[PDB]
Design a protein around this motif. Structure first.
Motif, short mmCIF file in Angstrom:
data_model
loop_
_atom_site.label_atom_id
_atom_site.label_comp_id
_atom_site.label_asym_id
_atom_site.label_seq_id
_atom_site.Cartn_x
_atom_site.Cartn_y
_atom_site.Cartn_z
N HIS A 125 50.22 -73.31 25.53
CA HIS A 125 49.16 -73.22 24.52
C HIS A 125 49.55 -72.46 23.26
O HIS A 125 48.79 -72.46 22.29
CB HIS A 125 47.92 -72.55 25.11
CG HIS A 125 47.32 -73.30 26.24
ND1 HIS A 125 46.35 -74.26 26.07
CD2 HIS A 125 47.55 -73.24 27.57
CE1 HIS A 125 46.01 -74.76 27.24
NE2 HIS A 125 46.72 -74.15 28.17
N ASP A 126 50.70 -71.80 23.25
CA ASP A 126 51.05 -70.90 22.13
C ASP A 126 51.25 -71.74 20.87
O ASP A 126 52.04 -72.67 20.87
CB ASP A 126 52.35 -70.16 22.46
CG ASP A 126 52.59 -68.94 21.61
OD1 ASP A 126 51.95 -68.80 20.54
OD2 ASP A 126 53.45 -68.12 22.01
N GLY A 144 39.37 -68.40 20.90
CA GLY A 144 38.56 -69.54 20.48
C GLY A 144 38.39 -69.68 18.98
O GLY A 144 37.78 -70.65 18.52
N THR A 145 38.92 -68.73 18.21
CA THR A 145 38.74 -68.76 16.76
C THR A 145 39.45 -69.96 16.12
O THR A 145 40.61 -70.22 16.41
CB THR A 145 39.30 -67.46 16.12
OG1 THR A 145 38.77 -66.31 16.79
CG2 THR A 145 38.93 -67.36 14.66
N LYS A 151 34.85 -64.27 22.40
CA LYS A 151 34.24 -63.56 21.27
C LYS A 151 35.07 -63.91 20.04
O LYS A 151 36.07 -63.26 19.74
CB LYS A 151 34.20 -62.08 21.56
CG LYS A 151 33.35 -61.27 20.66
CD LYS A 151 33.12 -59.87 21.36
CE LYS A 151 32.09 -59.03 20.76
NZ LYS A 151 32.11 -57.71 21.34
N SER A 152 34.72 -65.03 19.42
CA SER A 152 35.55 -65.64 18.41
C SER A 152 35.28 -65.05 17.02
O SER A 152 34.18 -64.59 16.72
CB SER A 152 35.32 -67.15 18.39
OG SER A 152 33.99 -67.46 18.04
N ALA A 164 41.44 -73.86 17.94
CA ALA A 164 40.79 -72.89 18.83
C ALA A 164 41.88 -71.96 19.34
O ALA A 164 42.65 -72.32 20.22
CB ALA A 164 40.08 -73.59 19.98
N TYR A 165 41.95 -70.75 18.80
CA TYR A 165 43.06 -69.87 19.13
C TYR A 165 43.06 -69.61 20.64
O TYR A 165 42.01 -69.31 21.20
CB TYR A 165 43.01 -68.56 18.32
CG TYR A 165 44.38 -67.96 18.19
CD1 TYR A 165 45.31 -68.50 17.30
CD2 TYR A 165 44.79 -66.92 19.01
CE1 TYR A 165 46.60 -68.00 17.22
CE2 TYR A 165 46.10 -66.42 18.93
CZ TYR A 165 46.99 -66.96 18.03
OH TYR A 165 48.29 -66.52 17.92
N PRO A 166 44.22 -69.73 21.30
CA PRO A 166 44.19 -69.78 22.76
C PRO A 166 44.12 -68.42 23.44
O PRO A 166 43.90 -68.36 24.65
CB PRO A 166 45.52 -70.45 23.10
CG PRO A 166 46.41 -70.08 21.96
CD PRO A 166 45.52 -70.15 20.77
#
Ligand SMILES: [Cl-]
Length: 235
Positions: A27-28, A95-96, A121-122, A59-61
């Motif tokens: 996911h990186d 998730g950001t 908590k995005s 969506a930042y993992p």
């Protein structure tokens, strides 16, 4: 074999630390630029990123803290924008939707929670070096060599997708005995200096502007003879 790892010096002088190049996992969003000094079985990772372009992530993992050492990054998420120059820090929540726009030849230290343990908590949270702090717990009296210090902190980011608490801390001088670290900790010194004496009997001087990572379980003695202020990420 948990240990204390110097991630970056203020002047970017060589550190002893070995880094693994490549994505932390599938996911990186980073790969060639990702230089990992530590990852534990439960997903906490620390290291540095070298990057010089922009990349967008839907969506930042991970939950990931960045501490700038060279260059500059602008983090954008919708109408939010945060720019970090050397010595500045921010958090990307899990998730950001985020664009990470690095000037050429930029370098930052990171600590990431790559495993989720609760809900996202995005968003992006900037971390002011001059944050106002309130009293926080000194070390256990039973491990002290010096008198107990006065410590203060401000948990500027408290994750719900991990146990990470990220913020600014300060303390008057103190010395304690070597103990295995109770949690994982990234520190970047805003002011002062600390000597960390290690399991193998060697010593690391962490100076102002340096970033160090102390793995959970790493034997570490702390000695400070002056005030210290730091950014931290702790589990
Ligand atoms: Cl990369």
């Amino acid at each position: 074999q948990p240990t204390v790892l110097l991630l970056a010096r203020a002047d970017l002088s060589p550190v002893g630390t070995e880094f693994t190049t490549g994505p932390i996992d599938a996911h990186d969003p980073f790969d060639s630029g990702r230089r990992t000094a530590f990852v534990d079985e439960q997903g906490i990772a620390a290291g540095i990123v070298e990057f010089g372009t922009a990349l967008s992530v839907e969506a930042y993992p991970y939950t990931e803290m960045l501490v700038m050492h060279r260059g500059s990054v602008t983090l954008t998420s919708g109408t939010d924008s945060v720019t970090l120059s050397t010595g500045e820090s921010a958090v990307i929540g899990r998730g950001t939707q985020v664009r990470i726009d690095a000037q050429p030849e930029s370098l930052w230290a990171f600590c990431a929670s790559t495993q989720a343990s609760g809900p996202d908590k995005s968003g992006i949270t900037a971390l002011d070096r001059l944050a106002l702090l309130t009293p926080s717990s000194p070390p256990d009296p039973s491990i002290m060599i010096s008198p107990l210090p006065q410590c203060r902190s401000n948990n500027l980011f408290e994750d719900t997708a991990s146990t990470l608490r990220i913020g600014v801390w300060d303390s008057t001088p103190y010395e304690r005995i070597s103990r295995p670290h109770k949690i994982h900790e990234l520190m970047n010194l805003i002011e002062g200096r600390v000597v960390l004496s290690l399991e193998n009997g060697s010593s690391l001087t962490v100076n102002t502007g340096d970033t160090v990572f102390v793995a959970q379980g790493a034997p570490c003695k702390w000695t400070s003879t002056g005030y210290v202020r730091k950014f931290y990420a702790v589990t």
